[PDB]
Amino acid sequence: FTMKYVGSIDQGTTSTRFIIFDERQRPVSVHQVPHTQHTPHPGWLEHDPMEIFRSACKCMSVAIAKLRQKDASFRKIEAIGITNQRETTVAWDRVTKEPLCYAPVWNDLRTYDITKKVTAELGGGDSMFASKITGLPVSTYFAAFKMRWMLENVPAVADACRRGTLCFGTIDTWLMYKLSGGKAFVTDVTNASRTFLMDLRTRKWSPELCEKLKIPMETLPEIRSNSELFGYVETDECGVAAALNERTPIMGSIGDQQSALFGNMCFEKGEAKNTYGTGCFLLMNVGEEARFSKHGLLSTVGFQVGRDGPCYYALEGAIACAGATVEWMRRNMNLFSHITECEKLARSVPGTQGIVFVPAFSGLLAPYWDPSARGTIVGMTLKTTRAHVIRAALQAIALQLNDVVGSMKRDAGLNLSSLRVDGGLSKNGLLMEIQASLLGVDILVPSMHETTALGAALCAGLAAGVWTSLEEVKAVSRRENSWKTVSPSGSAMEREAMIAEWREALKRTKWAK
Template identity: 30%
Template sequence: MGQYILVLDQGFLNSSAFLVDSHAKIIARFEVPLKPRFLRSGWIEYNPDDILKSQLNAIKALFRKIGTKKKQIAALGISGQQSTIILWDKETGKPVYNAISYNDPRGMDICRQRTGRREIVRERTGLHLSPYYSASKIKWVLENVKAVQKLADKGRLLLGTVNTYILWHLSKRSVYVMDHASAAKTLLCNIFTKTWDRELLELFNLPHEIFPDIVPTSSYIGDAVIERQVIPIHASITEKQASLLGHGLFQEGDVSINYGDDGLMLANTGKKIFLLPGLLTTIAWSNHESTTYLLEGIINSAGSFLSWMKDNLGLIGPKEDIEKLCKGSLNRLFMLPSLDGLGSPHWDSDSTVCLYGLKKGSKREDIVRAAVEAIAFMVKDNVNVIQTDGRLQLKKIIGSGAVSDISFLMQFQADILKMPVRKVKENHYTALGTAFLAGLSTNIWQGFSSIGKLTSSSSARVFNPRLSEQEAAKLYERWRLTFYHSREWSRNFP
């Protein structure tokens, strides 16, 4: 039996293929760029054929690179964009409309028409009623694309995420599934039963018959046929959840914070399902025996706000080091960088950017520092929800993403959380996490304990808290006052 795993990663801007060995080493990889189409009013689409071709081209290029090693591939795993949706004709295999991206807001009106049922959506899916999940996108296609409803009536309409679409084609149309993690981000899957929820399907007036089977993220799904080679499919998962696995955050209480254009906090809750105010709840990964769940927090402005300060305000020079600017600050200011409103746990789309504490001696270094520290404060807001509830004890925090390269931010995050923060280097963690799921399913690895030493956290740089508890609490209290005054301003002067 071979000991290599073929990993496919279908992302927003590229499709990649990786060969991973039994020591969790990436032996080879190949990436093919993918161009989304940016349309009116923030709509974002892809040509589904481009998605499929880019993924197939990545596989072909990888196979040329690895030569005879391809014969030793034991399993295939795939990770992909959550909530990006494709509908296609079962008989022809052709898409009936473009793929609608996860961050496409066109389903807003469809969601608004159902706001009276938002509590049942929350209780069964762990999510907010939002156009950024799949349900409203599917409904939009059925309502606006001619002949789609006729295909559904004839039993010819299929739908799914990019994972579903790619696996259906790679398996010669024999595998029609959606994994637990992907299904959980549709607004149509009950995370308690892990099945399509008939009441939620009725809420969006969607026929149950067109939906794929729901399967564990780590299990034998079927066989892919690639260049006449049969490869068992053993994993399918969303990118964010795969990255959590790749960082080695397997245990209850482990937390990942990704600092990119926006921020994302994922907290492993083990087998327990927590529905906490302001946070999202979803499925992390699963097999036939058990399911692991997550709490999710979203920070709307992180790297994107720093880019805005650079490009629109000129506060950061083209090649200027943000780290040096922060260290050059002598006066502390407080900022709420809600350029795109506030994400969790407040969910306030009307909040505006506010800066407090400006004096005659204030400089741009102070403003940049305030923006960087605000990212840490917003993460603290999310962590506070968990700590206030008290049932989940946080054990390990890992920071990743481009903005985490700012050491000043990582140190302040540790200070304000009063917990060590481990900063890891970027190393294709999504691919590694997907490989772990496939390898566990095929017994290349025997349980999570056997892959713990292969993950990133063992080589992380650790930032330990330096501020006293009293000083950290005082700073957070002052920032919360900034937050309060900003929201009052937004409410009184919309």
């Protein structure tokens, strides 16, 4: 009788937006609000959690209102899913319902000294002492250190903790907390797997990790799946409750990168997504047993649909950003003006004719690891032109992705089914070909590219009955938002020549000391 709509709040590193998705998985209304990136000292990043919570509410309320206008037939949101930046941590008080201090970003480096102290005191020297428990190396990224830090260097936080009134939260939790007026204090599994305090395999807070890091468990929220009731939105900031005009439940909460995996329909062992965002990540779905890395990839929770639903695990590798190289080529080097020029200039030549470009601008962080590596170009002749370099560029981007997928294949004990690209510089026709060829697989490019926000909408849609199964969901995608599939089309021969070059060229990149 009536159309169905599901809302996704997408809380990113530098902004927030609310996309309302159609029953046919169409983004039909959006609104973005940026938030200040506070940098008190070089290397520090903080976010005003109250600014963020107002952003979300505004985005929500503008977006609803816009639609009430261009679409009759839209009377309400069935359910709201939240997808958010991961490992930013928030500290707030059960009674004030106000944050104690700004929250440090996954980026933020303030935890450096706490990081080194843990590897030495608790790891015996070994940064990986807890990786079989968490899937994570000791690092400045993960929540628990940001938590330690705030208990260590913030008077309000330490007192609250001591008084018994402290809540630590990831952005999903903070958002569900405020959005619900304070009733909901919950976290989804993809997020909690980024705190350093969950047993990866059991998916419960680790008491042996909580006590060693003296993080009290009454400060932590209730771990839940990605899809199910988390609480209701009933707050009036910015008119939101009124806008919903209808008792809307939050039924979905999932980490961004994992949200991209999920909205790109990577439901099976083998499938992978490669997002280009503020960070660059490759996630591969490894199935129901958690696989652990040998080559410095993270082990994480892919997704989990329903409290007693199955939990699919993931390996995550941070690949260096493609756009970076294409940007520098253009901004710093003036190799092409700008725009589509990059692809046409690359397409305009057969191949690279001998040269390799390793864009190791800050070392190499793939399975190959060195910070001693610097951006290098080798094998140029007087015949070499900006055309070849820009190609070498694409090729090397494509090639880096392969080395990571290389490791991921080994640890996971499986072969890449396909790879989905999000369609950013993935607008790049040639890179797609270079990459599909190289990896031995169907590279997938979707026509509806709001895939991150979608992950969380699909999580909510499922919990609420907008869509009934991962089967139904994937049918609709193909019926409605037709993917474009790009086939491998090179020759086994050439593929190994491009890899040998690429490896022979990596033996040239060490310059830093």
